[PDB]
Amino acid sequence: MTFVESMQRRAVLAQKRLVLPEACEQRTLEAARLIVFRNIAAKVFLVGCERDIKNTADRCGIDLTDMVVIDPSVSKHRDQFAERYFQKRKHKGISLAQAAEDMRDPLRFAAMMLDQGHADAMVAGAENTTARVLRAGLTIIGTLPSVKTASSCFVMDTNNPRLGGTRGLFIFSDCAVIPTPTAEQLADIACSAAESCRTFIGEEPTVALLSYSTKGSGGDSDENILRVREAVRILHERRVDFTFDGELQLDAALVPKITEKKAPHSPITGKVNTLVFPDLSSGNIGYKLVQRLSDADAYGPFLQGFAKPLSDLSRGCSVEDIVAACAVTLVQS
Amino acid sequence: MTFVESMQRRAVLAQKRLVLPEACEQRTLEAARLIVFRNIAAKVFLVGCERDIKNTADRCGIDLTDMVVIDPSVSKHRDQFAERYFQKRKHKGISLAQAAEDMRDPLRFAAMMLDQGHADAMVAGAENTTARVLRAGLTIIGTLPSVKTASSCFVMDTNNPRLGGTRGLFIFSDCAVIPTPTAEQLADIACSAAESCRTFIGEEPTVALLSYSTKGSGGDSDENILRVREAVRILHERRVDFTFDGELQLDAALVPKITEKKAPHSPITGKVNTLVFPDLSSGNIGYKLVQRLSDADAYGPFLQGFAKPLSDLSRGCSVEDIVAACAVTLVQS
């Protein structure tokens, strides 16, 4: 199958709970109906003002009978959610009443459903800004204990077995979120990209931390080189369970003859399927170069490192983009 | 007609003067022979100790007949070159006699031939470090008046006229030399890359200065975004004669449907053939991704911005590689 087909079938198998806070938006509700029709989720929670949602559904001819509308103003969890948000945020000086008002927002309320164990996967961003989506994620859901940084990746399908990797499948990370990762964040990015490789490609991760330098060739003074080198040291210190090396140029990562000249006895030779970029320009430009100048497909961006999975959509997304993002996030949980 | 054959043919038509300071190296003399045999240059100057050069030739069985040995020890330009070097370098405290000894070095002498008008193109690096070759370039030859920075590009051939560019050809720059260009340096790289587009691809240059941000989308705080935006302002101030725009994501540069959304009314829409990367990691990773994960070929790195063309070879280059480098550098004059 294709990647999208495989992710949808795996979501059907996983039978997890989806929450959608942009439930007054037509595309979101159409996606929710397709999710129900395809059995992509065990439960579909629509979060928002009940009569605004029902009104949108009425006008778009959408049956909600297998969906659960949760209204943050009326929910039985309202008081507990306001209290949990206050405890989370009181260190920034907000009041309990400000917390209660903030938790009437569908985006915050859906994120708190994940934090509190009432749903498994959240998708938003067809109508909210990326900044708002990531902020709800960072401040309500938080990160896994193994990282301090939330990041993102793309799944790159070169549609060419022979191009190395895992039958031409790669994880590229972080090509969308963190502008200039510190050495510690870069190590976090590598750890989360390793998890993404296991979830999305289904093979063991072999990770190359990339640079214009290979194992010293660029010198010892450029902070950008040292940042990547320090990340590699940090990964050794952390005793991670995946194979990794850096700093490596792309050709040293992917062409064994070159690895043998520039990085001898490197443990990644001939096996790399996960590329960690040194900064956001290199990764954002890089994945687009592969997408737009070759027959490769790029899937994502997929968020990683969050304690519970969420996705941020483009504001111009299609219904099927929403469905695809929901399936991937459900498979991540 | 391939790219290497196109350049070889064009050098034959151009009938320029080549200087080779590594004339005691066997591959260089074998290349020199092919260059004479193929009429790729009007004149082939071998620079060095005539006896060491003749000795190498005899040991290897190489005929030198239509080549001209120019011996820095006895050349009629001996005293003028020493004075010129002294004037260039006296601000570092050297004496005239030291300048004269310095100008017995074949590499320095070849570069001075370019500066003084006695040859058109220099190739070295088969047995000199890149740093040595570049330093000779910068201290002796200098840069064109339109820039203060020498840099490099690659000619990328996607082998697919629909991918954009000029029949599938692109200039990528600077993917090999400057680790973190200042805004002034990025503007210089754009100017030099536009020159290389004209020389190597043969079409009008349309230059995209790349970033993870498109026309403000990544905000106004990240210094790497501002460096690119500043370089664009600088190009406007210089009133350059090529079309440019930035900061642009790669898809906004290359995909007009996306340009119309993220960069409406951009001057580059649908015409970009020259990509300027914001730093060396993004460019070095970027060109290699295209080379290694697609059908594209990568030719270079080609130096650019020097007042007279020179080329740095790889230490392990083939004889045919040397010939191809000479032809490109001659086409560059």
Numbering used by the authors:
A (entry chain A), B (entry chain B): 1 to 333
According to the publication:
This enzyme is putatively identified as TP0094 and, in this study, we determined a high-resolution (1.95 Å) X-ray crystal structure of the protein, finding that its fold comports with other known Pta enzymes. From these facts, we infer that TP0094 can act as a bona fide Pta enzyme in T. pallidum, and we propose to refer to it as TpPta henceforth.
Domain II (amino-acids 150–305) also features a mostly parallel central β-sheet, but the penultimate of its six strands is antiparallel. Although several water molecules are observed in this cleft, there was no evidence of substrates or products bound therein. The two monomers are intimately associated, burying 2,640 Å2 of surface area, and estimates of the energetics of this dimer using PISA indicate a strong likelihood that the dimer is stable in solution (i.e. ΔGint = −22.6 kcal/mol). Moreover, the C and D monomers adopt an “intermediate” conformation in which Domain II is rotated only by about 5–7° relative to the open form. It is this intermediate conformation that most resembles the conformation displayed by both monomers of TP0094. Thus, the conformations of Pta may be important for the enzyme’s catalytic cycle, and the intermediate conformation of TP0094 comports with its lack of substrates or products in its putative active site.
